[PDB]
Design a protein around this ligand. Structure first.
Ligand SMILES: *[C@@H]1O[C@H](CO)[C@@H](O[C@@H]2O[C@H](CO)[C@@H](O[C@@H]3O[C@H](CO[C@H]4O[C@H](CO)[C@@H](O)[C@H](O)[C@@H]4O)[C@@H](O)[C@H](O[C@H]4O[C@H](CO)[C@@H](O)[C@H](O)[C@@H]4O)[C@@H]3O)[C@H](O)[C@H]2NC(C)=O)[C@H](O)[C@H]1NC(C)=O
Ligand SMILES: *[C@@H]1O[C@H](CO)[C@@H](O[C@@H]2O[C@H](CO)[C@@H](O[C@@H]3O[C@H](CO)[C@@H](O)[C@H](O)[C@@H]3O)[C@H](O)[C@H]2NC(C)=O)[C@H](O)[C@H]1NC(C)=O
Ligand SMILES: *[C@@H]1O[C@H](CO)[C@@H](O[C@@H]2O[C@H](CO)[C@@H](O[C@@H]3O[C@H](CO)[C@@H](O)[C@H](O)[C@@H]3O)[C@H](O)[C@H]2NC(C)=O)[C@H](O)[C@H]1NC(C)=O
Ligand SMILES: *[C@@H]1O[C@H](CO)[C@@H](O[C@@H]2O[C@H](CO)[C@@H](O[C@@H]3O[C@H](CO)[C@@H](O)[C@H](O)[C@@H]3O)[C@H](O)[C@H]2NC(C)=O)[C@H](O)[C@H]1NC(C)=O
Ligand SMILES: *[C@@H]1O[C@H](CO)[C@@H](O[C@@H]2O[C@H](CO)[C@@H](O[C@@H]3O[C@H](CO)[C@@H](O)[C@H](O)[C@@H]3O)[C@H](O)[C@H]2NC(C)=O)[C@H](O)[C@H]1NC(C)=O
Ligand SMILES: *[C@@H]1O[C@H](CO)[C@@H](O[C@@H]2O[C@H](CO)[C@@H](O[C@@H]3O[C@H](CO)[C@@H](O)[C@H](O)[C@@H]3O)[C@H](O)[C@H]2NC(C)=O)[C@H](O)[C@H]1NC(C)=O
Ligand SMILES: *[C@@H]1O[C@H](CO)[C@@H](O[C@@H]2O[C@H](CO)[C@@H](O[C@@H]3O[C@H](CO)[C@@H](O)[C@H](O)[C@@H]3O)[C@H](O)[C@H]2NC(C)=O)[C@H](O)[C@H]1NC(C)=O
Ligand SMILES: *[C@@H]1O[C@H](CO)[C@@H](O[C@@H]2O[C@H](CO)[C@@H](O[C@@H]3O[C@H](CO)[C@@H](O)[C@H](O)[C@@H]3O)[C@H](O)[C@H]2NC(C)=O)[C@H](O)[C@H]1NC(C)=O
Ligand SMILES: *[C@@H]1O[C@H](CO)[C@@H](O[C@@H]2O[C@H](CO)[C@@H](O[C@@H]3O[C@H](CO)[C@@H](O)[C@H](O)[C@@H]3O)[C@H](O)[C@H]2NC(C)=O)[C@H](O)[C@H]1NC(C)=O
Ligand SMILES: *[C@@H]1O[C@H](CO)[C@@H](O[C@@H]2O[C@H](CO)[C@@H](O[C@@H]3O[C@H](CO)[C@@H](O)[C@H](O)[C@@H]3O)[C@H](O)[C@H]2NC(C)=O)[C@H](O)[C@H]1NC(C)=O
Ligand SMILES: *[C@@H]1O[C@H](CO)[C@@H](O[C@@H]2O[C@H](CO)[C@@H](O)[C@H](O)[C@H]2NC(C)=O)[C@H](O)[C@H]1NC(C)=O
Ligand SMILES: *[C@@H]1O[C@H](CO)[C@@H](O[C@@H]2O[C@H](CO)[C@@H](O)[C@H](O)[C@H]2NC(C)=O)[C@H](O)[C@H]1NC(C)=O
Ligand SMILES: *[C@@H]1O[C@H](CO)[C@@H](O)[C@H](O)[C@H]1NC(C)=O
Ligand SMILES: *[C@@H]1O[C@H](CO)[C@@H](O)[C@H](O)[C@H]1NC(C)=O
Ligand SMILES: *[C@@H]1O[C@H](CO)[C@@H](O)[C@H](O)[C@H]1NC(C)=O
Ligand SMILES: *[C@@H]1O[C@H](CO)[C@@H](O)[C@H](O)[C@H]1NC(C)=O
Ligand SMILES: *[C@@H]1O[C@H](CO)[C@@H](O)[C@H](O)[C@H]1NC(C)=O
Ligand SMILES: *[C@@H]1O[C@H](CO)[C@@H](O)[C@H](O)[C@H]1NC(C)=O
Ligand SMILES: *[C@@H]1O[C@H](CO)[C@@H](O)[C@H](O)[C@H]1NC(C)=O
Ligand SMILES: *[C@@H]1O[C@H](CO)[C@@H](O)[C@H](O)[C@H]1NC(C)=O
Ligand SMILES: *[C@@H]1O[C@H](CO)[C@@H](O)[C@H](O)[C@H]1NC(C)=O
Ligand SMILES: *[C@@H]1O[C@H](CO)[C@@H](O)[C@H](O)[C@H]1NC(C)=O
Ligand SMILES: *[C@@H]1O[C@H](CO)[C@@H](O)[C@H](O)[C@H]1NC(C)=O
Ligand SMILES: *[C@@H]1O[C@H](CO)[C@@H](O)[C@H](O)[C@H]1NC(C)=O
Lengths: 471, 144, 144, 144, 101
């Protein structure tokens, strides 16, 4: 009867959280017995029993664009990079001037493919001074380099011109600590006490909005946090239906996230063998030079099954009718920078910039058979890079090492990020195009189900009973 | 049903309270396995940085949260157990209701939703009104 | 009344204790509002040194003193609330003085300094001679 | 009896508990004499290192252990005293025993040699049954 | 604690700064320079002792061998003349250099 206000404890309560999640991994990352493979800071191992408990008859609004996990995520990634970079020796003497010859005693100088990658063969080899362990002694050593990591100077425009590194004239560079690897590891972000992570188990749930099929969880599932521009590699699948997401679907600047339910064997590869030469500069300064390769040296390139691309495109364009029944066009990005213009990723230390130009050459306006029936395997040119400035910050730069041997990157694509045209008509013809300046969406494209929540166990309710009384 | 298993349950949610508090401060079970003592995988350099130290800070902050909880429970005479009786009747400010519909037609979420503002008041009552006017024992009747 | 409301009082001082405690232990809301996660406006390097780790260490040490306070409360069975008597009678070590005039004209320190060591020895005595001498039950008259 | 006090006892050491509980959460004692604000004598460099963060995180883990202990105690609803008994007896699953001779021939460790197959049974059974089975109030027999 | 935390914060702020080890190299400063005024409003043994000199020295590019001359301005408090030689001969040296880093 009376509203005697009683208190209770031990029931879930939901509020937004700002905290940190922690490492997790299997035995491989610690059975490798390398100093640290690529997250390893005496990181906690994983929990073999994920207590992912399912809840129903509740609902909540979920958003990945208001999420704080991505900011802390890339902050921790930069911390990993810096901490792994502390043991790396400095490469300021490596910036010293270098004289190059383009042609060498290789069997092939212009390979079979011609997609503006062989015309700009971008292969030279240069000699330059370095320090000997005796300060009074220096010595000229030679290695191999491309044209992307350097630029011409002293413009006697073409007579054996010397070159200079792009990042040294503005920033600092250091070794990559070649003993550390660069491949991903299955991660499972874990929740500390006082917090939890809610996975939206609704098979139909798009990016944001209301979700009900709740899964309260302490530690996430297996994540493969690899960087990619315009693409999602080695990621999860789309359950039940192709997923299409956008912050403001009406607005055009907001990028469009796509998650497929069918993968593709993307093999970007350098088959021709590589070279490594460890050369002592100083007491600790040891440079890993790209030696002179023996045999035929073709430019590194890449392969995809364009037929699976075509059928997955039929799927997504059957799904893409937001306000339409048949209109779509794809156009390549008309400008920007190489870090955003191509599909850039890291693999075996080498930064593979594989050129995803095979998308826009298509007109799926009404019919899909005309591009599904030409089932054909696509070969494409993929460039290689040694240095990088991750997240566009001009600070310390990494010099990835030679990879001596061959390089294969065979992987599963599962998603894409795009943008619709800026100055597009109202209903004449919609246009999409690729965009990769936002490096942050690649990480929320899988944590979209995951929302971090605090825990306020306090509860209150009225009842008719009462506590002890004296008089 | 480790922490949740109350989908549409308020009165039925008045019996599964302890299954939540069993795993409240059990992040230690998730933390004891860190093996961050000096080295885990092969070896490490000093390598004790923002991740580890601010994980420790988060341990500290959750500990402080639940300790300030436990001390304001003790202020309420409430550390004895989860179910926590009060001598406080609600001042007549809410709308019409029933002793069961409030206790039956929600899942422990709608309550804190609709009692956002008022909640503070009740605290101070159970913080002060239940406490100051408490006396020690009785005088008249005994075993003999 | 964080520490005030008692210039020389024992009655008013004893009445103004909870305000002092709830104002003293409000540091957790200061700790929640740090917002020092990595960066304050634009960019920062690590910047975590003896200053911050020993800020946290001072937090730990002060709250550890408080943990020992709750330990004391658990020892004496004194964890119920602040109103907590003692079964020991005050020995004659003190020099002659009246009770209410100590309540009114010693501000709780002119008493403590005079009974400082005796407070320590009687702390020890109330810890030892109190809890070990609790009988189990009485069977003459009970519920049944 | 700093850390000793039981050479060979099962009942005599049932009341010597307070000496070791006095030091269960006493990390501040050895710490007070450190003078570790940043330096001691005039000045120094930062100098807090893997050693320092190791002792800090060691204090953290010890405090965490103690907090989990008191959490377990509070869950049982039996925190009012260290020596507190149970409303349920033990299943006679060991060898048919004798209380007296069992209380004579072990340094409070031999009893523990036959419990790894019986630890969880006791733990979970008590923690669930002896906790959930506490109803709210009595009805008939009171002053009135 | 005040002065200790002050020096600690100054150290921590000194860490991200860039270094000036090769900037310590020898110098040559001219006192008399292309300027008109030499007698300011006040004359208390500080105007004739104008304590302003324009001074050249070598510096290094990001590379090793690349070195280029460059000039700046300095007072008299920052440097001292090497009287060890026969005379000045436009020979000066920083004192913070030849005491510490
Ligand atoms: C950084 O650079 C130089 C190179 O070593 C050093 O700087 C100081 O150099 C002076 C002299 O070279 C040291 O001694 C002082 O010299 C003052 C002026 O020089 C007269 O005296 C010297 C003999 O000492 C004669 O050779 C010279 O011709 C001059 O006649 C003197 O005045 C000093 O004595 C007294 O003078 C002052 C001002 O009147 C008085 O107020 C004082 O009481 C003082 O006693 C003194 O003889 C001087 O010591 C050097 N400084 C330091 C810190 O050592 C530095 O040594 C060098 N850094 C390092 C680390 O070596
Ligand atoms: C790789 O090289 C082959 C040839 O070895 C390229 O194919 C050739 O491309 C040129 C240039 O587009 C074609 O010539 C052009 O023809 C058009 C008319 O179609 C004319 O308007 C232009 O002025 C020019 O003459 C040429 O016909 C074509 N030949 C063949 C056999 O394909 C190929 O395009 C190159 N790869 C890439 C990616 O460009
Ligand atoms: C993801 O799924 C949700 C549904 O769970 C989609 O919800 C969208 O909701 C809005 C409002 O409820 C619908 O109407 C629109 O409202 C805005 C104002 O908010 C108004 O400006 C528009 O003109 C329109 O009336 C909207 O139709 C509905 N979307 C769909 C596709 O039905 C959300 O759009 C989905 N988002 C993505 C990126 O797929
Ligand atoms: C790109 O990568 C994918 C997977 O990483 C490659 O798929 C696999 O390709 C190999 C040959 O390169 C196939 O093995 C061969 O299959 C044929 C036909 O069954 C057989 O006659 C041969 O003896 C040999 O076993 C393999 O079956 C295939 N994987 C699957 C699941 O079918 C793909 O070939 C790569 N593409 C390029 C251009 O490198
Ligand atoms: C992507 O896949 C294609 C085709 O699977 C690879 O093409 C390879 O191209 C080279 C020449 O550019 C071929 O070399 C010659 O092949 C013929 C026929 O097999 C042989 O008789 C010659 O002695 C010579 O070896 C090579 O065969 C061909 N690969 C295949 C499987 O036919 C391309 O290398 C792949 N990788 C990329 C684009 O990175
Ligand atoms: C990424 O791949 C795309 C195509 O997959 C590249 O675009 C294409 O590049 C070729 C070679 O530069 C263009 O061919 C042009 O043909 C005309 C014919 O007259 C000739 O005059 C030009 O000199 C040039 O050779 C082609 O038009 C162009 N666009 C297409 C096919 O739509 C792109 O360059 C690649 N980017 C990188 C960074 O690898
Ligand atoms: C996929 O392509 C097929 C054709 O290959 C489309 O179907 C047929 O398209 C033709 C020409 O577009 C239609 O002819 C029409 O004839 C009337 C006079 O009878 C004329 O007034 C129209 O302007 C047009 O020329 C034909 O009716 C149409 N048939 C069917 C069954 O659709 C098909 O529509 C394409 N797919 C999609 C989704 O549009
Ligand atoms: C998909 O790839 C396969 C090979 O990996 C292609 O196989 C053969 O491709 C030729 C043309 O490229 C087909 O020729 C045509 O065959 C049809 C009968 O199916 C005939 O009516 C046409 O006049 C022409 O001769 C050939 O049939 C095909 N092989 C088989 C067994 O069908 C295949 O064409 C590729 N499909 C597409 C849509 O590109
Ligand atoms: C996406 O995931 C796939 C599946 O794991 C990756 O393929 C595998 O990549 C690893 C290295 O990341 C390969 O192992 C390496 O092989 C070299 C060969 O010399 C060895 O020296 C290394 O120590 C290491 O064992 C593995 O062969 C390869 N293929 C599989 C598992 O079939 C792929 O690399 C991932 N994507 C990217 C961009 O890395
Ligand atoms: C701060 O200003 C004072 C005031 O000038 C400087 O101290 C010294 O002041 C006396 C004035 O009594 C100057 O004495 C001069 O002596 C000559 C010869 O006897 C006489 O003709 C002048 O009329 C004047 O009395 C003395 O030169 C001056 N010291 C210096 C070094 O200039 C003091 O040095 C100033 N401090 C700073 C840091 O600027
Ligand atoms: C570029 O590479 C060629 C590879 O041949 C270098 O020339 C070789 O130098 C080695 C060093 O003694 C000799 O043993 C080979 O006989 C040389 N081969 C040829 C074909 O000359 C050349 O020096 C390199 N140049 C630069 C600038 O790095
Ligand atoms: C405490 O109460 C205020 C007002 O009662 C809440 O403000 C709500 O604000 C939104 C938008 O401004 C209104 O649409 C609601 O009607 C307001 N609530 C009410 C009950 O009128 C405020 O959100 C409450 N505080 C918290 C923490 O929930
Ligand atoms: C919700 O999750 C449960 C898992 O217990 C699953 O059986 C059910 O199909 C899911 N429903 C939806 C709509 O995702
Ligand atoms: C992917 O989802 C679409 C629905 O959008 C469905 O038509 C297609 O069959 C699915 N493909 C799979 C599960 O391979
Ligand atoms: C999306 O953007 C359009 C214009 O760009 C604007 O009219 C609309 O209100 C926006 N909607 C949301 C939900 O931001
Ligand atoms: C060339 O490639 C072969 C692979 O067949 C490899 O065994 C060899 O070591 C390579 N040559 C080098 C690294 O000089
Ligand atoms: C699509 O059709 C248009 C005709 O308006 C043509 O200009 C364009 O080149 C076509 N797309 C491709 C990839 O060729
Ligand atoms: C890619 O998918 C195939 C099956 O679709 C699977 O066998 C393979 O292991 C996957 N590779 C990845 C995820 O790297
Ligand atoms: C939601 O599912 C059913 C149907 O609404 C309901 O009876 C149940 O109490 C709710 N909670 C669950 C299934 O956990
Ligand atoms: C108590 O309720 C009355 C009437 O419902 C209202 O006038 C008064 O403001 C309320 N006071 C508080 C403290 O809620
Ligand atoms: C100050 O207030 C009155 C007036 O001076 C005095 O009686 C009292 O003892 C003083 N101290 C207090 C109120 O703590
Ligand atoms: C304490 O002060 C009160 C008020 O001034 C006075 O009545 C009383 O006699 C004093 N007692 C002492 C000084 O012992
Ligand atoms: C208790 O003991 C009896 C008899 O030994 C046995 O049958 C039963 O399984 C035991 N139960 C437990 C929970 O140990
Ligand atoms: C300048 O010198 C004259 C004479 O030497 C003196 O009278 C006057 O005070 C000086 N000026 C200043 C500003 O000291």
């Amino acid at each position: 009867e009376n509203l005697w206000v009683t208190v209770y404890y031990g029931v879930p309560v939901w509020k937004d959280a700002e905290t940190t999640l922690f490492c997790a991994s299997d035995a491989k990352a610690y059975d490798t017995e390398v100093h640290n493979v690529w997250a390893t800071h005496a990181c906690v191992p994983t929990d073999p029993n994920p207590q992912e408990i399912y809840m129903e008859n509740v609902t909540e609004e979920f958003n990945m664009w208001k999420n704080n996990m991505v900011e802390q995520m890339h902050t921790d990634i930069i911390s990993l990079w810096d901490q792994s970079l502390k043991p790396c020796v400095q490469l300021t003497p490596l910036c010293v001037t270098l004289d190059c010859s383009y042609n060498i005693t290789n069997n092939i100088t212009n390979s079979i493919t011609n997609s503006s990658v062989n015309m700009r063969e971008e292969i030279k080899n240069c000699s330059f001074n370095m320090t000997t362990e005796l300060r009074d002694k220096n010595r000229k050593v030679y290695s191999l380099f491309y044209k992307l990591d350097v630029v011409q100077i002293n413009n006697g425009n073409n007579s054996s011109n010397l070159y200079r590194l792009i990042n040294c004239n503005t920033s600092a560079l250091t070794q990559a600590c070649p003993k550390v690897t660069f491949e991903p590891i299955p991660i499972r972000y874990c929740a500390p006490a006082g917090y939890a992570i809610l996975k939206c188990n609704d098979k139909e749930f798009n990016g944001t909005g209301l979700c009900k099929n709740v899964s309260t969880v302490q530690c996430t599932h297996g994540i493969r946090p690899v960087v990619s521009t315009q693409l999602l590699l080695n990621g999860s699948l789309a359950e039940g239906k192709v997923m299409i997401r956008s912050e403001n679907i009406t607005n055009n600047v907001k990028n469009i996230i796509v998650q497929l339910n069918e993968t593709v064997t993307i093999n970007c590869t350098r088959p021709n063998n590589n070279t490594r030469k460890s050369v002592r500069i100083g007491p600790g300064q040891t440079f890993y030079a790209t030696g002179d390769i023996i045999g035929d040296i073709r430019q590194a390139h890449c392969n995809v099954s364009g037929s699976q691309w075509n059928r997955a495109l039929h799927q997504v364009v059957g799904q893409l009718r937001e306000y339409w029944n048949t209109t779509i066009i794809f156009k390549n990005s008309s400008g920007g920078d190489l870090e955003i213009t191509t599909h850039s990723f890291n693999c075996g230390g080498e930064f593979f910039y594989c050129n995803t130009s095979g998308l826009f050459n298509s007109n799926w306006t009404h019919n899909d058979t005309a591009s599904m029936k030409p089932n054909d395997t696509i070969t494409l040119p993929c460039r290689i890079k040694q240095i990088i400035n991750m997240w566009q910050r001009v600070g310390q730069a990494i010099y990835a090492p030679p990879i001596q041997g061959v390089i294969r990157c065979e992987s599963n694509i599962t998603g894409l990020i795009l943008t619709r045209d800026g100055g597009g008509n109202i209903n004449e013809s919609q246009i999409f195009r690729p965009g990769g300046g936002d490096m942050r969406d690649n990480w929320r494209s899988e944590l979209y189900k995951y929302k971090v929540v605090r825990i306020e166990p306090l509860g209150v309710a009225p009842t008719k009973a009462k506590r002890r009384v004296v008089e | 049903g480790f922490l949740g298993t109350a989908g549409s349950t308020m009165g039925a949610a008045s019996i599964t309270l302890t299954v939540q508090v069993r795993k409240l401060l059990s992040g230690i079970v998730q933390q004891q396995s860190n093996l961050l003592r000096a080295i885990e995988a092969q070896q490490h350099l000093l390598k004790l940085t923002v991740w580890g130290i601010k994980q420790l800070q988060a341990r500290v902050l959750a500990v402080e949260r639940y300790l300030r909880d436990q001390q304001l429970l003790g202020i309420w005479g409430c550390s004895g157990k989860l179910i926590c009786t009060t001598n406080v009747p609600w001042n007549s400010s809410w709308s019409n209701k029933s002793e069961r519909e409030i206790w039956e037609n929600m899942t422990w979420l709608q309550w804190d939703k609709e009692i956002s503002n008022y909640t503070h008041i009740i605290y101070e009552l159970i913080e002060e009104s239940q406490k100051q006017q408490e006396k020690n024992e009785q005088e008249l009747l005994e075993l003999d």
